[PDB]
Design a protein around this ligand. Structure first.
Ligand code: HEM
Ligand code: HEM
Ligand SMILES: [Cl-]
Lengths: 106, 106
């Protein structure tokens, strides 16, 4: 069974939500697509997350991309869990997309 | 954004296989994982595909990465189809992975 996988666009909007992401986070892919990825985390990260993406696009200075971090995730039901996050960047049709891989540490 | 997404490791081994990829290629994620991505393409690309990955790891000079290409995919039943392929490079746990988006052009 693989880890959860999520794809966002350059403004943090979820574009793809894997089957393992559905199970872990509780949202169906249809529900998750079109929402900001910030729904998947507690405060204060949630309020700050757009700024993290914007800063990266401005500076190209990675903090988690290619680096990884243990962080706290938040499920649809409101409960939280420890998770490892890896992130990649790619271009498709001239626009940036970020792919995140989420390992449930519980 | 194409709906079909495939993730491979630095040796071409499938790590993740999204639901649209499963539908398009006719393989379960549970079955695709651990197989070489070369199962998804006809010859001659199939038997050259490892060399493409290894040459990229050597040179860091993209061919398809960041650019895209129309290529031929192969379903489990042997039938083929035109597809647009987009690819990005990423790192997780200090190892390279490749994120591929597949657009069926049928
Ligand atoms: C769901 C739990 C998540 C948490 C708690 C979280 C938290 C964070 C934090 C704290 C940063 C800033 C790092 C720093 O400046 O110290 C960050 C950056 C970023 N995150 Fe999230 N994130 C989560 C999920 C995701 C996912 C799933 C993606 C991609 C699909 C993603 C994409 C990004 C991007 C593109 C950046 C900016 C690049 C970078 O700083 O390396 N995040 N995230
Ligand atoms: C299934 C249909 C596919 C076909 C027919 C195909 C074919 C090719 C071709 C023709 C090249 C360029 C060879 C050259 O430079 O001479 C290539 C390179 C490459 N492909 Fe595949 N590919 C397919 C799927 C994928 C997928 C899904 C991924 C990733 C998940 C992937 C990862 C790579 C990588 C990492 C390279 C080398 C880097 C680059 O070209 O920039 N391929 N592939
Ligand atoms: Cl990582």
């Amino acid at each position: 069974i693989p880890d959860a996988m999520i794809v966002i666009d350059g403004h943090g909007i979820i574009q793809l939500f894997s089957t393992a992401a559905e199970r872990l986070f509780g949202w169906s892919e249809l529900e998750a697509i079109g929402q900001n990825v910030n729904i998947l985390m507690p405060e204060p990260d949630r309020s700050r997350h757009d700024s993290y993406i914007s800063r990266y696009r401005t500076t190209s200075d990675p903090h988690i991309i290619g680096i990884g971090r243990i962080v706290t995730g938040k499920r649809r039901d409101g409960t939280t869990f420890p998770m490892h996050l890896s992130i990649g960047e790619m271009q498709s049709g001239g626009e940036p997309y970020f792919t995140g891989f989420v390992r449930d540490l519980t």
